[PDB]
Amino acid sequence: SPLAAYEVDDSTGYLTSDVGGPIQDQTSLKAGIRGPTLLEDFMFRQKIQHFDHERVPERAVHARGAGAHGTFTSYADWSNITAASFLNATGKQTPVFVRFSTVAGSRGSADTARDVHGFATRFYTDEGNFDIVGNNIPVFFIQDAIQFPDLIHSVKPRPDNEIPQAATAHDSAWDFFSQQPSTMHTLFWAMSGHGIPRSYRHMDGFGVHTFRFVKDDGSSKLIKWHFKSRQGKASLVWEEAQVLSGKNADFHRQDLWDAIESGNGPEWDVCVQIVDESQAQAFGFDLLDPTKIIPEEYAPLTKLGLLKLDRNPTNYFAETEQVMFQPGHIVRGIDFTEDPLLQGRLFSYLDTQLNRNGGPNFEQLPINMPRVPIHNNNRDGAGQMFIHRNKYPYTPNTLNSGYPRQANQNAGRGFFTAPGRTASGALVREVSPTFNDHWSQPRLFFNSLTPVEQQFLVNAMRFEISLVKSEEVKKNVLTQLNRVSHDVAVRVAAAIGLGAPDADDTYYHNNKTAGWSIVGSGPLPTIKTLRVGILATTSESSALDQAAQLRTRLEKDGLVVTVVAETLREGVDQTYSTADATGFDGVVVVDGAAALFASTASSPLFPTGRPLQIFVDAYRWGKPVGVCGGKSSEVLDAADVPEDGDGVYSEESVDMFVEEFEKGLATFRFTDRFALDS
Amino acid sequence: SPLAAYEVDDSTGYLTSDVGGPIQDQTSLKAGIRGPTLLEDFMFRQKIQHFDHERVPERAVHARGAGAHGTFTSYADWSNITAASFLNATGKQTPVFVRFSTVAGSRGSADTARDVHGFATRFYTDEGNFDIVGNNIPVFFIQDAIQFPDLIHSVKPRPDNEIPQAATAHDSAWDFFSQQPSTMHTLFWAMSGHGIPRSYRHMDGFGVHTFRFVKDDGSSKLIKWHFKSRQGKASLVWEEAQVLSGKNADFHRQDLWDAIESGNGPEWDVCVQIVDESQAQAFGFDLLDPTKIIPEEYAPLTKLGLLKLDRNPTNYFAETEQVMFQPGHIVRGIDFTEDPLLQGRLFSYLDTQLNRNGGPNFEQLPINMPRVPIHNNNRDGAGQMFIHRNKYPYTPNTLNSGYPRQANQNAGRGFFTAPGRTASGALVREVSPTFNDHWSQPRLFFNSLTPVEQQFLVNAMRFEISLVKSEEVKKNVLTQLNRVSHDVAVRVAAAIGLGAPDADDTYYHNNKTAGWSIVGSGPLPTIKTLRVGILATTSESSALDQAAQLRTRLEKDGLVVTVVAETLREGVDQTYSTADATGFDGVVVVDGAAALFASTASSPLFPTGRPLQIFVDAYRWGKPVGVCGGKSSEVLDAADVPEDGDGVYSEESVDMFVEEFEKGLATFRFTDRFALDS
Numbered sequence A, B: 001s002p003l004a005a006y007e008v009d010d011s012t013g014y015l016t017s018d019v020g021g022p023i024q025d026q027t028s029l030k031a032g033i034r035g036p037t038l039l040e041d042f043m044f045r046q047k048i049q050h051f052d053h054e055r056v057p058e059r060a061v062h063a064r065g066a067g068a069h070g071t072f073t074s075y076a077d078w079s080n081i082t083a084a085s086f087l088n089a090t091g092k093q094t095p096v097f098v099r100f101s102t103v104a105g106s107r108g109s110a111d112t113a114r115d116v117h118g119f120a121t122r123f124y125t126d127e128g129n130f131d132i133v134g135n136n137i138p139v140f141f142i143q144d145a146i147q148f149p150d151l152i153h154s155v156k157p158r159p160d161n162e163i164p165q166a167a168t169a170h171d172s173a174w175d176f177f178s179q180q181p182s183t184m185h186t187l188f189w190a191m192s193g194h195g196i197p198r199s200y201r202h203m204d205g206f207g208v209h210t211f212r213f214v215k216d217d218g219s220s221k222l223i224k225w226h227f228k229s230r231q232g233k234a235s236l237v238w239e240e241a242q243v244l245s246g247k248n249a250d251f252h253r254q255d256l257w258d259a260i261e262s263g264n265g266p267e268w269d270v271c272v273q274i275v276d277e278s279q280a281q282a283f284g285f286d287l288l289d290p291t292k293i294i295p296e297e298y299a300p301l302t303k304l305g306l307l308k309l310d311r312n313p314t315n316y317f318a319e320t321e322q323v324m325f326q327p328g329h330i331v332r333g334i335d336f337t338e339d340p341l342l343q344g345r346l347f348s349y350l351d352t353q354l355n356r357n358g359g360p361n362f363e364q365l366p367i368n369m370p371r372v373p374i375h376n377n378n379r380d381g382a383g384q385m386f387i388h389r390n391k392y393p394y395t396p397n398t399l400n401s402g403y404p405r406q407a408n409q410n411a412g413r414g415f416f417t418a419p420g421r422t423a424s425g426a427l428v429r430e431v432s433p434t435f436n437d438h439w440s441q442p443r444l445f446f447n448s449l450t451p452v453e454q455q456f457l458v459n460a461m462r463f464e465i466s467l468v469k470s471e472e473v474k475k476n477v478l479t480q481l482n483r484v485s486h487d488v489a490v491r492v493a494a495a496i497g498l499g500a501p502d503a504d505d506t507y508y509h510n511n512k513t514a515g516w517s518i519v520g521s522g523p524l525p526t527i528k529t530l531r532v533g534i535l536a537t538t539s540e541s542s543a544l545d546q547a548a549q550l551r552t553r554l555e556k557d558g559l560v561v562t563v564v565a566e567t568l569r570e571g572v573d574q575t576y577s578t579a580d581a582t583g584f585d586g587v588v589v590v591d592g593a594a595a596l597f598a599s600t601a602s603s604p605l606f607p608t609g610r611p612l613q614i615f616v617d618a619y620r621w622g623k624p625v626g627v628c629g630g631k632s633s634e635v636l637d638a639a640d641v642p643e644d645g646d647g648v649y650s651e652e653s654v655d656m657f658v659e660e661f662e663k664g665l666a667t668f669r670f671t672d673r674f675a676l677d678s
Ligand code: HDD
Pocket: A059, A060, A061, A062, A065, A099, A100, A101, A117, A118, A119, A120, A133, A134, A135, A140, A144, A145, A146, A148, A206, A207, A208, A209, A290, A323, A324, A325, A341, A342, A344, A345, A348, A349, A352, A353, B048, B052
């Protein structure tokens, strides 16, 4: 472990206090065997005091998340574009820590809520910690950081009763969206499959803001960060996400942990779009505007290196809960832009750690420490762990010989502000007119989805907006949607029994761009780690033998196989009672188990109809399903599943079955099973 | 009320800072229209600082919960048994605040996790705040407060990856239960329907510990607090609880809020069992042991008064999140016992508020303030909101004329320790042998459940233990369960493919007691607030007219009616897309909607088979279901629901249908639909 120096081992030895005195901790000291507990019981108090103070404030946003360690490897010497030391040589390795998250939910809320997702990466570089604090969606709801509490109050639970948890499906959120049109772009992304990703591994990371790369000669270029998943992009469907939020609140964190433990640690290409300073307004919008994306057709990705997560934490609290990211953790070679959303973030992340940590020495927590020496005149504060030998911590000094020395552009590899940056004009609390088109890019995004994806997005909006109580807010929502697409407004209006306003075509267009569509990103590049549930029975020795044979053939290709039956025994992982279609990417029934597949099928060991429900749920949610053994028409008829269907498999031969089935797992979702408007 | 003085109205006026200076908060101050943000923007920083510091540590246990205001009314002058002032006169009214909760989950976890539930009541009495910090289960897992971190660490998520949220279904919890046999009694309760109550209103409250009632003459008796629900006892079924955890994490808090808003604020009889000091060991166990209950057959309930919750909070955070309960909040007329669990609690709750509040003046928060004058020498501390006039805050003094005066048994209505209490013997960290029978009362509890309830408990254990990975832990669990009941151990063993150990009859017996069974507690005494979903369609005017007719007749009797159709319009509350059987206590399909229940039924407006699934789920989960308004075998046949079944209703006549259906809502659950072992 990168944090091995801090680890404490308790695999041997006797219980001690925190000051090393051996003690016991199982019975209170009392005045007699049936007597009251004594104040002088220090063993009791030290233990309970610690317990009583275990909690810390959850993060103000992105409270629900999980993390892992890894390594970043540069693909080249990037000195041609940046002074950044972690990018300065082919093959240069830097340790990382990544945390993924939702936004709105509190720390025990479900992973599979519909939400924007955090993707926060720390690079522990040889010139200091560098953090890229990104999301899985490339654009943000608002154009100025000062609005962040308004956005967050609106999407978080209503503050009288704190309902609803981890959801935008309430009046306040849609009130805000409808009144603040900047929100439309991120809203469309959140309402697409990007709002309910299959896993953290199957989503991308984006810095969102324009940043600068600064060379050692002082020249700069404008960049956007894109972390492109090597596992491919995949989404849940909403009805699946909802059940999964109940069956397994921990789904995304379990998925990540398991992938790492099995040697399938996720990878991303760390990429940038790079453009000249002179192109700040060349693409038909302002690069300072965090509601806008540069189409890849206008500015291609450069792959900088590989991010791989391959080690799980030892202690969640100490590593994942305490990691304290900051966009202020910047290194020489990177600089900010005048994005008013970014500008205000720089304040927030330094301040909020005082809340979380309760003290100013939060950079001394192991997970937060850098991997190079610290030389500065910061001193004291609660929880101060260092013992500083320099007794003249001021500049300028002679009594410590002028140390520490100042670092800048020309000495000490100092950070420096890009020297071509300037400001001009009045000191204003005014929005740039260049930010005023809130609707064209939401339309570009909608236009770039496939027909079934467009339907899923409409369906997400119909779901959420149908739960808004205020008729005025609903009308206001359709007004805003209508500015993006008349068709969207019509289709959503139909579900909520309002009429859509007349078409307003000011921002309508038919342009499209590549790389935003989930459904359109073709088969997954790997099916390693995908989950196959094999539904079997203990009532037939032949069913368990078919299940074992399938297990062997599927595990050979790196699939995670679960054999399901009525009761556990050797070879059976899970009972029907605990099994659900949300647990699998594909479902196979062995044809020795066909008798379980009545909807009438009843047992004290699982809920009525459970075996068939798992198969039917899997089919309805677009998953590859099949029967293995040659006799398929009893199972398929019970389930109302057509044998001829795409992503439906039946074969006697285990080998032929698995070859077909694995193409289905790569396809991932069979979208022909979903009805479309008109 | 301290609350009314601190209410803040923002229905009019201009935005101000916290110091009353009018400001704006929508655009950052910048150096030029596309410039960097300025450090001198105090509007920005005060708003973001506040946002950055909004969160406080969640409670270490019972983090997920909800609260309401109410009133307690004494039924009599109880001077004959206690000096407590809030019980000293017929009709005497005291304001209350109650918070209900789960135990293990974090703040945004689901209400319908399987868990023990908190029921914490504050009485703002005219002699000081009195808190009864209870649970919905009358016994606790452990016999000594020093063990509480062990219990809690074992049941909370595994600390390497923080999985799983809000669940005992993991190895560590079952390891603890199997190694610490005291846990068996509470474990049986949590594995019964008491682990998944239908609502906070449909559960009881217990103080758990033996306390003392102390008279003004100094004499004392031993008491147990029982708050008996006037709404009746009701439970979910597990599969329903699981879906509901995903469809509506806020189910119990929504239920409570809605009942209060509709004028159906929940009620409890506040009761005690009262016995003599000489009976500490008369009932076959030790009244100091918090794993034991006194059977009502040995000690009947005395009703002391009425608890009614009837007002929702104004601000969740300020009231519900900040309320800081303590068993240390005791009043004259009540005393502690030497219950080692209770003894240690007294320390914990005073200490933990320093964590939550971040400072020592947490009793000054409006929700924590008393309703009588405070006279003491407590001074200073962070957040000090008082300006004390008394400049000689020490006793004894002459310079403040000897005020405040000391209060005790003889003067000033002081609190006093029951004067009959003694201690004798060695100072020991030893458990009383009188605590050693961990298995008889778990068996009494199991024996007192009906056959279908015994099956649900066995099924909950089969579910959880099947998810334990360690075969050794599973074996250890069976060893412990076997000491309670060989039959339980055999039936649980069958689901996990182990053999149960041989019968060990040391603690086996056939005794039963009344008042623990949910299923056996007869029909609900009221059906007000129960939810009826009416499944209809917009494609038939007749379906909406049947729905309206049913609505009228059901709303008349105080039922909360939801009409479901494809799309919203006048008369329709919810779409099929957002509807689920977990939203209803009963489900009615109107005859005119029969076309939606065909297997070929598909729509872009809801998932395939949604209408039928709602009906079938409702039936499977034991709910009253029916079809109203023709000769209506088409819907019952599609659902495979037998017309002759108990809790299945089929009538042409709206009036006849409703009369029958409402008896079904009172019966609540039709337990005949659940399979039993053999
Ligand atoms: C002005 C305030 C503000 C604004 C405009 C933003 N955020 Fe932020 N963000 C915070 C204030 C903040 C915060 C309150 O400071 C958090 C809470 C915890 C923390 O360390 O910082 C936070 C946490 C946080 C985390 C969790 C880091 C972790 O896992 O611990 C992520 C991934 C993001 N944010 C991402 C974004 C992105 C991609 C944004 C826009 C492009 C963004 N935030 C705008």
